[PDB]
Design an enzyme around this catalytic site. Structure first.
Site, PDB file in Angstrom:
ATOM      1  N   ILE A 172       0.823  -1.207   0.000  1.00 49.97           N
ATOM      2  CA  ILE A 172       0.000   0.000   0.000  1.00 49.97           C
ATOM      3  C   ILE A 172       0.859   1.260   0.000  1.00 49.97           C
ATOM      4  CG2 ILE A 172      -1.856   1.212   1.196  1.00 49.97           C
ATOM      5  CD1 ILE A 172      -2.608  -1.417  -0.196  1.00 49.97           C
ATOM      6  N   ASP A 199      -0.506  13.563  16.970  1.00 42.99           N
ATOM      7  CA  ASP A 199      -0.319  13.857  15.551  1.00 42.99           C
ATOM      8  C   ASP A 199      -1.668  13.820  14.835  1.00 42.99           C
ATOM      9  OD1 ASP A 199       1.895  14.297  13.446  1.00 42.99           O
ATOM     10  OD2 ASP A 199       0.739  12.660  12.552  1.00 42.99           O
TER      11      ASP A 199
HETATM   12  C1  LIG Z   1      -1.801  -1.306   9.603  1.00 44.74           C
HETATM   13  C2  LIG Z   1      -2.077   0.180   9.419  1.00 44.74           C
HETATM   14  N1  LIG Z   1      -3.373   0.281   8.776  1.00 44.74           N
HETATM   15  C3  LIG Z   1      -3.566   1.146   7.624  1.00 44.74           C
HETATM   16  O1  LIG Z   1      -2.668   1.803   7.223  1.00 44.74           O
HETATM   17  C4  LIG Z   1      -4.948   1.188   6.968  1.00 44.74           C
HETATM   18  N2  LIG Z   1      -6.013   0.911   7.697  1.00 44.74           N
HETATM   19  C5  LIG Z   1      -7.227   0.921   7.179  1.00 44.74           C
HETATM   20  N3  LIG Z   1      -7.434   1.189   5.906  1.00 44.74           N
HETATM   21  C6  LIG Z   1      -6.419   1.462   5.107  1.00 44.74           C
HETATM   22  N4  LIG Z   1      -6.662   1.756   3.707  1.00 44.74           N
HETATM   23  C7  LIG Z   1      -5.125   1.464   5.614  1.00 44.74           C
HETATM   24 CL1  LIG Z   1      -3.751   1.833   4.532  1.00 44.74          CL
HETATM   25  C8  LIG Z   1      -2.034   0.842  10.794  1.00 44.74           C
HETATM   26  N5  LIG Z   1      -1.389   0.288  11.893  1.00 44.74           N
HETATM   27  C9  LIG Z   1      -1.515   1.155  13.072  1.00 44.74           C
HETATM   28  C10 LIG Z   1      -2.257   2.316  12.740  1.00 44.74           C
HETATM   29  C11 LIG Z   1      -2.581   3.434  13.731  1.00 44.74           C
HETATM   30  O2  LIG Z   1      -3.333   4.295  13.419  1.00 44.74           O
HETATM   31  N6  LIG Z   1      -1.943   3.416  15.040  1.00 44.74           N
HETATM   32  C12 LIG Z   1      -2.190   4.435  16.049  1.00 44.74           C
HETATM   33  C13 LIG Z   1      -3.486   4.809  16.357  1.00 44.74           C
HETATM   34  C14 LIG Z   1      -3.696   5.779  17.324  1.00 44.74           C
HETATM   35  C15 LIG Z   1      -5.112   6.213  17.682  1.00 44.74           C
HETATM   36  F1  LIG Z   1      -5.420   5.700  18.908  1.00 44.74           F
HETATM   37  F2  LIG Z   1      -5.186   7.576  17.714  1.00 44.74           F
HETATM   38  F3  LIG Z   1      -5.978   5.726  16.746  1.00 44.74           F
HETATM   39  C16 LIG Z   1      -2.603   6.334  17.960  1.00 44.74           C
HETATM   40 CL2  LIG Z   1      -2.842   7.582  19.213  1.00 44.74          CL
HETATM   41  C17 LIG Z   1      -1.330   5.913  17.612  1.00 44.74           C
HETATM   42  N7  LIG Z   1      -1.175   4.989  16.682  1.00 44.74           N
HETATM   43  S1  LIG Z   1      -2.700   2.269  11.200  1.00 44.74           S
END
Ligand SMILES: C[C@@H](NC(=O)c1ncnc(N)c1Cl)c1ncc(C(=O)Nc2cc(C(F)(F)F)c(Cl)cn2)s1
Length: 256
Positions: free
Chosen positions: A15, A126
């Site tokens: 991706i 962020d």
């Molecule tokens: C695996 C990857 N998933 C995607 O990229 C994706 N997902 C759905 N649809 C797509 N098209 C794509 Cl492409 C991700 N792994 C960790 C992710 C993340 O947000 N961590 C996070 C969240 C928070 C929050 F609590 F604020 F939410 C904080 Cl405070 C700190 N860290 S995102």
């Protein structure tokens, strides 16, 4: 435990690459997204456990549904797969023009998720329109899609540029900048040529988003809440319980 055994996830198309990891679209009891991280440093080992430890305490409709993690063969974070684009892509690239009815709904769902994060004592650190995903171009999903860790200065509060800094109000200022993009369709400080002064001017308290570029049909409550979210003093910025309350009441004013 949420550890996913090795061999169940079917990694597919890539991706997008980052300086800290790469994300793929995987198969695991449906469509999932897997962000895999050569030699893991003790910092990367802790930074992985910090991101998973935060996502474990999230169970909300407006927060990206964390599904599991893996350590073998690679450090990975498995979330749900959502179709669509981010808010930054809609307002500043695709130029999708939303009705004022939907702009408030996007801001409402964002405030609901930010309200849930602060209840769990979680600081987003962020928050920006690029980290606000519009699942099915309807439901707002809040996450952290950054793959490098800093080209995200427009959402940083003045006290975040002055390293003395992350707090609930620092996320509120970012939410205020997101409200600016929704009500203007443009990024703040668009008439500035370089970013050297933007770091120095905003940190000095002499540069603020020009609040006259907002659209005509923007309600007066949105203009007032946006201004309070952009106060230079942190203590003068409201909390998301008060922020969500005024948006949900304003939203019911448009629906007839
Ligand atoms: C695996 C990857 N998933 C995607 O990229 C994706 N997902 C759905 N649809 C797509 N098209 C794509 Cl492409 C991700 N792994 C960790 C992710 C993340 O947000 N961590 C996070 C969240 C928070 C929050 F609590 F604020 F939410 C904080 Cl405070 C700190 N860290 S995102």
């Amino acid at each position: 435990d949420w550890e996913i055994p090795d061999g169940q996830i079917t990694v597919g198309q890539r991706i997008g690459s980052g300086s800290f990891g790469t994300v793929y679209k995987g198969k695991w009891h449906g469509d999932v997204a897997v962000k895999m991280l050569t030699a893991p440093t003790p910092q990367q080992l802790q930074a992985f456990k910090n991101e998973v430890g935060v996502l474990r305490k999230t169970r909300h409709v407006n927060i990206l549904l964390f599904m599991g993690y893996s350590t073998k063969p690679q450090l990975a974070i498995v979330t749900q797969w959502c179709e669509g684009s981010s808010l930054y892509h809609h307002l500043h690239a695709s130029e999708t023009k939303f009705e004022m009815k939907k702009l408030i709904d996007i801001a409402r769902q964002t405030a609901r998720g930010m309200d849930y994060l602060h209840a769990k004592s979680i600081i987003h650190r962020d928050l920006k329109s690029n980290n606000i995903f519009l699942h099915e171009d309807n439901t707002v999903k809040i996450g952290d899609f950054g793959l490098a860790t800093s080209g995200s200065i427009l959402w940083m509060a003045p006290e975040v540029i002055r390293m003395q800094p992350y707090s609930f109000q620092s996320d509120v200022y970012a939410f205020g900048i997101v409200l600016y993009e929704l009500m203007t369709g443009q990024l703040p400080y668009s008439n500035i040529n370089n970013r050297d002064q933007i770091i120095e001017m905003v940190g000095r308290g002499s540069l603020s988003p020009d609040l006259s570029k907002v659209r005509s049909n923007c309600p007066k409550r949105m203009k007032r809440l946006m201004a309070e979210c952009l106060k230079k003093k942190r203590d003068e910025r409201p909390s998301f319980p008060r922020i969500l309350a005024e948006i949900e009441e304003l939203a019911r004013e448009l629906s007839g």
